Amino acid sequence: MHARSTGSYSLVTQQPLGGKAQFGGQRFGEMEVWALEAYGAAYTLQEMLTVKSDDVNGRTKMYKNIVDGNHQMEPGMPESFNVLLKEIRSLGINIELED
Amino acid sequence: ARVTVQDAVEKIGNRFDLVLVAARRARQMQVGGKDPLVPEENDKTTVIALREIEEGLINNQILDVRERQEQQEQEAAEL
Amino acid sequence: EFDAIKIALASPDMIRSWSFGEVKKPETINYRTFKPERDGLFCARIFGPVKDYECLCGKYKRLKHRGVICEKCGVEVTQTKVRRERMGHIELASPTAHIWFLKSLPSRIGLLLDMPLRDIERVLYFESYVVIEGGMTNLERQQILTEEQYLDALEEFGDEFDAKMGAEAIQALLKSMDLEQECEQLREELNETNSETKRKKLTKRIKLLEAFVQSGNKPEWMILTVLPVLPPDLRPLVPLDGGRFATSDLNDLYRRVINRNNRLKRLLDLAAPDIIVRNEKRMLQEAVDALLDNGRRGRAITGSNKRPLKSLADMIKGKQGRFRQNLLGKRVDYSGRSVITVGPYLRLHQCGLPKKMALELFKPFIYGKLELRGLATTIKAAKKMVEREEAVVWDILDEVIREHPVLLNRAPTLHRLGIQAFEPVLIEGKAIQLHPLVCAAYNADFDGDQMAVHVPLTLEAQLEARALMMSTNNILSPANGEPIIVPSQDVVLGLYYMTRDCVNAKGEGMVLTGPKEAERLYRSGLASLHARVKVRITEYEKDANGELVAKTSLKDTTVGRAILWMIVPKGLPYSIVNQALGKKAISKMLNTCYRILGLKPTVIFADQIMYTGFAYAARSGASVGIDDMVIPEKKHEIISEAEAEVAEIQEQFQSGLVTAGERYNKVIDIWAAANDRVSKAMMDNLQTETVINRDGQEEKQVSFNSIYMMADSGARGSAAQIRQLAGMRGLMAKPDGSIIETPITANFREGLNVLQYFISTHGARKGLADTALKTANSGYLTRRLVDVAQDLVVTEDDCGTHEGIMMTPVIEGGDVKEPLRDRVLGRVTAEDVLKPGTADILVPRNTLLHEQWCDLLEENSVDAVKVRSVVSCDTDFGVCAHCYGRDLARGHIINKGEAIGVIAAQSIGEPGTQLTMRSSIQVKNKGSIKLSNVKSVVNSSGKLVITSRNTELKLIDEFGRTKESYKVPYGAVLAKGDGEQVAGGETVANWDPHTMPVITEVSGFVRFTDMIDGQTITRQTDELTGLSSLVVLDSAERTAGGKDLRPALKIVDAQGNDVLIPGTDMPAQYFLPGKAIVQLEDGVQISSGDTLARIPQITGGLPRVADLFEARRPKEPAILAEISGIVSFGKETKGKRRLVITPVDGSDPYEEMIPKWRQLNVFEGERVERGDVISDGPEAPHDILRLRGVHAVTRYIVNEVQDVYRLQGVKINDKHIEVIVRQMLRKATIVNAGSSDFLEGEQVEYSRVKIANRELEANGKVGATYSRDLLGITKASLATESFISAASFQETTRVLTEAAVAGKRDELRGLKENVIVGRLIPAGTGYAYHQDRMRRR
DNA sequence: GTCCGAAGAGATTCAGAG
DNA sequence: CTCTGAATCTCTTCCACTCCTACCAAGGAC
RNA sequence: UGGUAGGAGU
Ligand SMILES: [Mg+2]
């Protein structure tokens, strides 16, 4: 048995999931987002992808909102995507979020 | 402790915009000072909004017209 | 903010623009001091400060200073978080080629320069000199020569010969080359080559040059002059917490590259001899190659313990890369995991949840409630109070989780139902309590199984889980309409025990007032649960629309059935309860309740059924014992008889009378017969074992044996399990697959000796390994299927198209494999269905077929109905709601925004674990004979021999469908004439497969076509006839002269003139294959209808499904007729057999090769229809698509996959396979460019060409013509328009390079791509937001 | 105080053949 | 002797969640 | 700490 509400995070700002060793969060694997989006559930998928995993600003804003009785959500951008952007830019390939 | 959604789905057939309208109504209740229309009995705002949608007194057009009335009241207080 | 992601090859100017500084010193942060070095990979000056809002130096460490730089430190005073964003650069002393654009299958740098990749590799590593600006020299600049050859050239030419070494020469050639002039020259060459093989790779070079021209990038940017460095925080030197620091294996590679570059710079300053400088340049280039892609070229540089270093490329691709591990597999907070256990007290929508787990998961909600109520003033006080788990905290917790659903999922999530939402109830313990009925969908087994829980935080997420994911909503599986909840193990056993009758029991013959009286009697013990009685039952039937009328009558039912009637809802009839109520009966009753009374009564009924079944199964006290499994008394006698027979056969073999193979086959047959007899005797003794004496005389009844009760009810076990428990275990196969001669005589009730146990262990281990690998194979197939069909979403509502596929029941020479009503249920019609009464229509054009419409279709029983399908949908980027039809999970047309692609892929991939890896025609029933594609010739005997290669023998019943259809080979005689009914069991057609007869038109003399004396024909002696029979000699066997002339037979009249075929001017000719025995010699009169010659005469598992969806060409494919016409043979067996065909209206020159080892069965004279096979064998789907169109290949793939799935017993609707097929054939090649700007050889998306053609027909310009193309699922996924979806799937490096050179721009709009980005997916509840965003643009 | 299998698809080549 | 076919080599991928237990890694020289 | 294997559970 294990559970986690908020703990440590890695360099990619995801939770380490050392299991019970370092208070890890259960991984929402690739085959689970398929089932989440097969239901047509978009908002749950968005919150699991951004607010509970990588959006550090989203994380702190959501935590502050919950204790105040509000249940809003700021989507933001996951930090894993920015890490990937920097990784690809490091190979001389230009990645840009053009508007 | 509502167990089914089918009866509320009959009001809004898509069952996908039902989530959107119910979320909007529940956000209106729990964030603003709005008090529920259907009587409340120690229930979360989720089920309160769903029960209102079931009774037929809440719809997307109803929410839109209510928002228009609040906008008119707000602009009236300005002058 | 953003709306697209663009890829471009970065210029060195862009690299410098990104950089906030320069890296020159290889040394990283000092080990002895916490301070980062001045010019290291971790530099505070060129990257962010180590401490946020504080400069490294003390004088500027104060937080007040904003955006200031210390004069000596040279470090900004911003937060440390920018250290992840800041990037640096290093200036390489010498240009180095980018590895990705090299050493690849496309060889883009090689394709640009049009010189062999080995030459590039030779030049880069300083082996062969390539010349630039040759000028007046005889040899061209593109050619490459050796170093000694370069010395000879320089002794020949002093200055005009310029040959550079390494990447510098390549960059010089890239700069020198001009794209547009080479483009026009290559286009001219393409116009001049006129050979398709030369067009290959030349069109590729032209496309690469055009992509470089259109994109705003220059080829010289491919050669790397400035190398970016990753931000230091991304590659961290994490402390060990002990001695020394960790190395990310990336800082090591960067250090190596920097050190080599600095050493090369020092050598340049010192002006070292050219050999040493070239060696150092090679070392630096190799270091850069190792940094960018370790192991791409040569062997990967290893840090220690023989573990290759993980380069930058290696940490993007693969399962361990960002794309799979982190972007799509983000770990989630507010989650927990624990062992699961069964709770029968729970309702359907509820689930157990430990108090400690609930307290930990819902902690922020508890804090908020404490702050609102006022017990805790600050967050720290609330945290301390919760850690103390005081009394008030539990009361607050009960309020929080009162109506907050939690998401529960199993470790493997195959179904859509693999994750479901429940309303939690606080329990004590450490195990999650799960509802027994729910566990069927989860595949949970309650044997150490674990399940993770997740908490939806936002209000939208809570509403979403309640509306969609709650277990009460998921009643019907999306794969097929059958219910997903069903009483499984103990509830079904209890219901079966309750609803059963005993011949004599306490309380028999009573007449009761109602079900309450029956319960009262059973409880008080006056009447038994199985006593037959007469109970007055109030039965409600909804004869009126929305109204129920009561019907009361006396019924002959047992006490148990009457007791069960109380929980049944009002609408259902009483006929369902009166039976024995096995598992199928319970499932049917639940489905009937769902059909009649809706959802809420069905949920209440399911809960009541589960409770009642559990209670009465417990009260029954069913148990298993060693006396329950009874061994038949005749087993010993049957075994003795079988052993006597096998000994007799062995004795016959000893004398040599019977061969060893036939002896083994007879032994196998004898043992199979003995096993069948033993099993039948045991089952007969078991099922009616109990004999009850009632009111005097004895009587027989169905036994109450506990094992038999378990088997009959379907609760557990089967016929095979009982056969193994109380009978012969049967013959067991060897690992190779052969059958062991001696079966396992002993059952499991009695002992098994050592040898029999070993024989059993063979198959047991084989099956275990089969399952262990089936898991992984099915997982991979499911992943490919999900990705190939991610984008499909029901976008529009109606297309108004008329094209559709034809639905007919599948008849494989026997009983109906699939009833017609099952395939067409829930699908709309493309065209109005015609009534069997002529000039009348049964069904309108665009009406959706449901149970009632199908039933009305059943009465008229029309076989062929046209149905709109997914592949025929004309809507671009999605399908309409009408083409898809029913949702298969709810009784409704599919809603807009449904993600049908993922549902289809998961439904297909779920049964994958079940799928393992490794004459005369007589009709059974009477009916009318239908014969199609037939050229019958009758002889004196009245038999009819068909000339056509493919002809269909069909049986018509009274209502008209083909009950049984058999393929009739060419040359099969026919018993009874067509159009008349034939009695059952009568052989309609007869033939000898070994010898193929040859059709003739009129009796007369024969002389062989292209007659040559002796070589064409030579008599062969036969012992049976006693006279030599003419046999056409083989082309190789006969001499050259005879083999050059066509071997065939021409009929001639008795007078001597050649016989011409009736109805045509040309003289009759009949095929004579090489080495074919001819029954009637040339110069011998024949009879009408006689034969002129004789010609001598596959996986069902998961790999078959993988091959079907991959559309791989079979090892031995079949050839077909590309264009209809009369067949001809221009040249025979000269290099390769040549076939020419000409259509009637205008002869068309045709060329075709037929291999010798492949037999050719098409007649030389008979006209062949387009798409007819010339060689029997497996058909490649590409040929089917190219010849017979999209509908035929769709039908073929659907039929084959369904036939594979039917054998295992699974049921998957055809709509999902049709969706996958639609996703497969998305690309169309341009037949003719037309007015539109599309290259002829280029391949474009079918939707784009459809849009362009529609725009052109809107104007006066003529549209382009296209040919559809079929691609495998892997190729289709990798060839999608967006590079993000392809990069996340497979082959990240290849697709990234292809997008880099082409400068692709990704518009998102996908499901996987939006998931990667982090936005709302276009499907489901995000559809409204996405369409609003589209409208605002 | 500081520094140096196995399965498949695909690209390339290569031997036959006219 | 160009030029469709067959030989070779060469790259890529082989499920998904945990429980853990260890092995591993830049100096003396200037 | 972090990367590797090693065994095990479903
Ligand atoms: Mg289990």
What's the number of CA atoms in the CB half-sphere (13 Å) around residue B49? Answer: 27
d(CA B12, CA B56): 10
Q: Are C554 and C535 in contact (CB under 8 A)?
A: yes
**Residue-number span of the structural domain to which C687 is assigned:** 626-768
Q: What residue in A sits closest to B16 (Cα-Cα)? A: A40
d(CA C1094, CA C1078): 6
Residue in this structure with the two tokens 């309640």, named with its chain if needed: C466
Residues in chain A closer than 8 A to B19 (CB atoms): 43
Q: Which helix (H) or strand (E) holds C492?
A: helix C490-498
Helices first, then strands: H and E counts in chain A: 4, 2
Q: Which helix (H) or strand (E) holds C1142?
A: strand C1137-1142
d(CA C645, CA C662): 14
- For residue C310, give the nucleotide whose C1' atom is nearest its CA: F3
Tell me: is residue C854 an annotated ligand-binding position.
Answer: no
Q: Do A5 and C316 touch (CB under 8 A)?
A: no
Residues 737-776 of C with CB under 7 A from strand E: 775-776
d(CA A10, CA A4): 15
- Tallying the residues shown for chain B, one arrives at 79
Distances in whole angstroms, Cα of residue C194 to Cα of each of C187, C208, C470, C487: 12, 21, 65, 70
Q: Do A71 and B30 touch (CB under 8 A)?
A: yes
Residues in chain B closer than 8 A to A69 (CB atoms): 30
The pair phi, psi for residue C1017, each rounded to 5°, is -140, 135
Nucleotides of D under 7 A from a protein CB: 3-4, 8-13, 17-18
Tell me the two tokens of residue C195: 């050979």
DSSP string, C155-175: HH-SSS-EEE-THHHHHHHHH
- Tallying the residues shown for chain C, one arrives at 1337
Tell me the two tokens of residue C366: 């508890």
In single-letter form, the type of residue at position A21 comes to A
Distances in whole angstroms, Cα of residue C16 to Cα of each of C200, C695, C875: 39, 105, 47
Residue in this structure with the two tokens 């060459």, named with its chain if needed: C189
Q: Which residues contact C799 (CB under 8 A, 6 or more apart)?
A: C873, C874, C875, C880, C882, C883
Q: Which residues contact C512 (CB under 8 A, 6 or more apart)?
A: C518, C521, C533, C534, C535, C536, C559, C562
The pair phi, psi for residue C417, each rounded to 5°, is -80, 5
Q: Is the dihedral of CA C438, C443, C449, C455 positive or negative?
A: negative
Cα distance between the two ends of chain B:
46
Distances in whole angstroms, Cα of residue C501 to Cα of each of C496, C587, C597, C701, C1170: 10, 21, 29, 9, 65
CA of C443 to the centre of ligand 1 (A): 8
Percent helix / strand / coil, chain B, rounded to 5: 60, 0, 40
Distances in whole angstroms, Cα of residue C74 to Cα of each of C20, C50, C456, C772: 12, 13, 47, 60
Residue in this structure with the two tokens 């309208």, named with its chain if needed: B21
Q: Do B31 and A72 touch (CB under 8 A)?
A: yes
Nucleotides of F under 7 A from a protein CB: 1-4, 9-10
Tell me the two tokens of residue C198: 């030369």
Q: Which residues contact B39 (CB under 8 A, 6 or more apart)?
A: none
- Judged by DSSP in three states, C91 sits in strand
- Judged by DSSP in three states, C938 sits in strand
- Judged by DSSP in three states, C609 sits in helix
For residue C937, the cross-strand partners are C945
Q: Which helix (H) or strand (E) holds C672?
A: helix C660-687
Cα-Cα-Cα-Cα torsion C1283, C1287, C1293, C1299, nearest 10 degrees, comes to: 0
Q: Do C459 and B23 touch (CB under 8 A)?
A: yes
Residues 445-464 of C with CB under 7 A from strand E: 450, 452
- Residue C760: count other Cβ atoms within 10 Å of its Cβ: 16
Q: Which residues contact C1268 (CB under 8 A, 6 or more apart)?
A: C1185, C1190, C1225, C1228, C1246
Distances in whole angstroms, Cα of residue B36 to Cα of each of B1, B32, B53, B57, C1002: 17, 11, 12, 11, 96
Q: Are C443 and C418 in contact (CB under 8 A)?
A: no
d(CA C759, CA C937): 57
Tell me the two tokens of residue C959: 């209502």
Q: What residue in C sits closest to A54 (Cα-Cα)? A: C330
Among the listed residues C466, C468, C420, C413, the one whose alpha carbon sits nearest the alpha carbon of residue C1324: C468
Distances in whole angstroms, Cα of residue A73 to Cα of each of A39, A61, A64, C746, C1328: 21, 8, 11, 67, 18
**DSSP one-letter code for C711:** H
- For residue C111, give the nucleotide whose C1' atom is nearest its CA: D11
d(CA C41, CA C24): 9
Exposure string of C19-42, with b = 16+ CB inside 10 Å and e = fewer, is bbbebeebebbeeeeeebbebbbb
The pair phi, psi for residue C1038, each rounded to 5°, is -80, 165
Q: What residue in C sits closest to A25 (Cα-Cα)? A: C333
Which one of A31, A45, A88 has the shortest CB-CB distance to C413?
A31
Q: Are A67 and C371 in contact (CB under 8 A)?
A: yes
Distances in whole angstroms, Cα of residue C412 to Cα of each of C186, C329, C330: 54, 14, 16
d(CA C446, CA C1004): 82
CA of C409 to the centre of ligand 1 (A): 13
Chain A partners (3+ C-beta pairs within 8 A): B, C
- Residue C700: count other Cβ atoms within 10 Å of its Cβ: 11
Tell me the two tokens of residue B14: 């898509």
Distance of CA C328 to the CA centre of its chain: 20
d(CA C11, CA C8): 9
Residues in chain A closer than 8 A to C415 (CB atoms): 35
Residue in this structure with the two tokens 């149905």, named with its chain if needed: C867
In single-letter form, the type of residue at position C829 comes to T
Q: Do C466 and B45 touch (CB under 8 A)?
A: no
d(CA C708, CA C580): 14
Distances in whole angstroms, Cα of residue C330 to Cα of each of A9, A35, A50, C34: 12, 15, 9, 33
d(CA C880, CA C143): 58
Q: Which residues contact C166 (CB under 8 A, 6 or more apart)?
A: C94, C123, C124, C126, C278, C281, C282, C285
Among the listed residues A19, A32, A14, A37, the one whose alpha carbon sits nearest the alpha carbon of residue A83: A14
Domain map (residue ranges) of chain B: 1-79
Tell me the two tokens of residue C549: 């009328």
DSSP string, C634-656: THHHHHHHHHHHHHHHHHHHHTT
Q: Are C487 and C583 in contact (CB under 8 A)?
A: yes
**DSSP one-letter code for C325:** I
- Judged by DSSP in three states, C1089 sits in coil
**DSSP one-letter code for C144:** E
d(CA A38, CA C887): 12
Helices first, then strands: H and E counts in chain C: 42, 45
**DSSP one-letter code for C1036:** T
List C residues 1201-1240 in contact with A (Cβ-Cβ < 8 A). none
Q: Are C428 and C355 in contact (CB under 8 A)?
A: yes
Between vectors from CA C492 to CA C491 and to CA C496, what angle results, nearest 5°? 120
Resolution of the experimental model, in Å, one decimal: 3.7
The reply to whether C411 has its C-beta less than 7 Å from any atom of strand F is: yes
The reply to whether C319 has its C-beta less than 7 Å from any atom of strand E is: yes
d(CA C88, CA C206): 36
**Strand stretches in C757-812, DSSP E:** 805-807
- Residue C1237: count other Cβ atoms within 10 Å of its Cβ: 8
Q: Is the dihedral of CA C574, C579, C581, C587 positive or negative?
A: negative
**DSSP one-letter code for C553:** E
d(CA C783, CA C1202): 20
The reply to whether C337 has its C-beta less than 7 Å from any atom of strand E is: yes
Among the listed residues A75, A68, A49, the one whose alpha carbon sits nearest the alpha carbon of residue C333: A49
Which one of C10, C330, C462 has the shortest CB-CB distance to A92?
C10
Q: Are B15 and C467 in contact (CB under 8 A)?
A: yes
Distances in whole angstroms, Cα of residue C1100 to Cα of each of B28, C666, C1205, C1211: 58, 28, 9, 16
Among the listed residues C905, C864, C907, C870, the one whose alpha carbon sits nearest the alpha carbon of residue C885: C870
d(CA C869, CA C1195): 11
- Residue C669: count other Cβ atoms within 10 Å of its Cβ: 12
Cα distance between the two ends of chain A:
46
**DSSP one-letter code for C982:** E
Q: How far does A85 lie from chain C, in Å, by closest CA?
A: 10
Residues of B with CB under 8 A from a CB of A: 16, 19, 23, 27, 30-31
List B residues 2-61 in contact with C (Cβ-Cβ < 8 A). 2-7, 9, 13-20, 22-23, 26-27, 30, 42-47, 49-50
Between vectors from CA C1253 to CA C1249 and to CA C1254, what angle results, nearest 5°? 115
Distances in whole angstroms, Cα of residue C1181 to Cα of each of A92, C220, C967, C1173: 42, 44, 21, 13
For residue C556, the cross-strand partners are C534
Among the listed residues A89, C1331, C1315, the one whose alpha carbon sits nearest the alpha carbon of residue A97: A89
Q: How far does C904 lie from chain B, in Å, by closest CA?
A: 20
Q: Are C1283 and C1306 in contact (CB under 8 A)?
A: yes
Residue in this structure with the two tokens 């005073």, named with its chain if needed: C77
Tell me: is residue C351 an annotated ligand-binding position.
Answer: no
d(CA A17, CA C1110): 37
Q: Are C1065 and C1165 in contact (CB under 8 A)?
A: no
Helix ranges restricted to H, C293-378: 322, 355-361, 363-373
The pair phi, psi for residue C709, each rounded to 5°, is -65, -40
Question: Assign residue B34 a region: left if phi > 0, alpha if psi is -120 to 50, beta otherwise?
Answer: beta
d(CA C100, CA C1293): 7
The reply to whether A24 has its C-beta less than 7 Å from any atom of strand E is: yes
Tell me: is residue C57 an annotated ligand-binding position.
Answer: yes
Q: Are C1070 and C1025 in contact (CB under 8 A)?
A: no
d(CA C818, CA C544): 34
Chain C partners (3+ C-beta pairs within 8 A): A, B
For residue C547, the cross-strand partners are C544
Among the listed residues C545, C541, C580, the one whose alpha carbon sits nearest the alpha carbon of residue C560: C580
Residues near strand D (C-beta below 7 A) are C 25-27, 105-107, 110, 116-118, 201, 259, 1107, 1110, 1112-1113, 1134-1136, 1272, 1275
Among the listed residues C417, C83, C334, C109, the one whose alpha carbon sits nearest the alpha carbon of residue C229: C83
CA C11 to C1' D10 (Å) is 31
d(CA C251, CA C1028): 89
Q: Which residues contact C780 (CB under 8 A, 6 or more apart)?
A: none
d(CA C970, CA C967): 10
Residue in this structure with the two tokens 């062999």, named with its chain if needed: C116
Q: Are C846 and C893 in contact (CB under 8 A)?
A: no
What's the number of CA atoms in the CB half-sphere (13 Å) around residue C469? Answer: 35
d(CA B24, CA C1119): 62
Q: What's C946's domain CATH number?
A: 2.40.50.100
d(CA C902, CA C1272): 18
CA of C445 to the centre of ligand 1 (A): 4
d(CA C1214, CA C806): 13
Q: What is the largest CA-CA distance in chain C?
A: 128
d(CA C1161, CA C1175): 6
**DSSP one-letter code for C1117:** P
In single-letter form, the type of residue at position C859 comes to E
Q: Which residues contact C893 (CB under 8 A, 6 or more apart)?
A: C848, C881, C882, C885, C886, C887
d(CA C328, CA C865): 43
Chain B to chain C, count of Cβ pairs less than 8 Å apart?
73
Q: Do C1316 and A33 touch (CB under 8 A)?
A: no
d(CA C296, CA C310): 11
Q: Do B27 and C459 touch (CB under 8 A)?
A: yes
Residues 299-328 of C with CB under 7 A from strand F: 305, 307, 310, 320
Among the listed residues C561, C564, C602, the one whose alpha carbon sits nearest the alpha carbon of residue C579: C561
